[PDB]
């Protein structure tokens, strides 16, 4: 029942071709239709997400490039992500992505 926020700087300087080199998936409460957020579904060992070496196929996304995915549902955060990986998170050669990790 413990969580921890984490910040990751992913340099898509040359990974934008694929979209940072990672795939995310969003879900909702198992009791109702309450979107919980998005979690790293997979990673592409070739771009920023790979070279980052700080990503985890399960971490919960809460923010990206200053934006807050929390308040955003699965679809909204997924769009902000696609938006960041499309032409916002980059525009420099990297994008910020905050997440949450459980503890035990």
Curated annotation (Swiss-Prot):
Gene from which this protein is expressed: Pard3
Protein name per the record: Partitioning defective 3 homolog
Tissue specificity statement from the Swiss-Prot or TrEMBL entry: Isoform 1 is predominantly expressed in lung, glandular stomach, prostate, ovary and uterus. Isoform 1 is also expressed in brain, with a high expression in the cortex, hippocampus and in the striatum. Isoform 2 is predominantly expressed in intestinal epithelial cells, kidney and prostate.
Species of provenance: Rattus norvegicus
Subunit relationships: Component of a complex whose core is composed of ARHGAP17, AMOT, PALS1, PATJ and PARD3/PAR3. Interacts (via PDZ 1 domain) with PARD6A, PARD6B and F11R/JAM1. Interacts with AURKA, AURKB and SIRT2. Interacts with PRKCI. Interacts with PRKCZ. Part of a complex with PARD6A or PARD6B, PRKCI or PRKCZ and CDC42 or RAC1. Interacts with LIMK2 and CDH5. Component of the Par polarity complex, composed of at least phosphorylated PRKCZ, PARD3 and TIAM1. Directly interacts with TIAM1 and TIAM2. Interacts with ECT2 and FBF1. Interacts (via PDZ 3 domain) with PTEN (via C-terminus).
Reported modifications of this chain: Acetylated. Deacetylated by SIRT2, thereby inhibiting Schwann cell peripheral myelination.
Compartments where found: Cytoplasm; Endomembrane system; Cell junction; Cell junction, Tight junction
Domain called PDZ: residue spans: 9-96
Entry's free-text remark on domains: Contains a conserved N-terminal oligomerization domain (NTD) that is involved in oligomerization and is essential for proper subapical membrane localization. The second PDZ domain mediates interaction with membranes containing phosphoinositol lipids.
Superkingdom: Eukaryota
Protein family per UniProt: Belongs to the PAR3 family.
Cited function: Adapter protein involved in asymmetrical cell division and cell polarization processes. Seems to play a central role in the formation of epithelial tight junctions. Association with PARD6B may prevent the interaction of PARD3 with F11R/JAM1, thereby preventing tight junction assembly. The PARD6-PARD3 complex links GTP-bound Rho small GTPases to atypical protein kinase C proteins. Required for establishment of neuronal polarity and normal axon formation in cultured hippocampal neurons. Involved in Schwann cell peripheral myelination. Targets the phosphatase PTEN to cell junctions.
């Amino acid at each position: 029942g413990t969580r921890e926020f984490l910040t990751f700087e992913v340099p898509l300087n040359d990974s934008g071709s694929a979209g940072l080199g990672v795939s995310v998936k969003g879900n909702r409460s198992k009791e109702n239709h309450a979107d919980l957020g998005i979690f790293v579904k997979s990673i592409i060992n070739g771009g920023a997400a790979s070279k980052d070496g700080r990503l985890r196929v399960n971490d919960q996304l809460i923010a990206v490039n200053g934006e807050s995915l929390l308040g955003k549902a699965n679809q909204e955060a997924m769009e902000t992500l696609r938006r960041s990986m499309s032409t916002e998170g980059n525009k420099r050669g990297m994008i910020q992505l905050i997440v949450a990790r459980r503890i035990s």
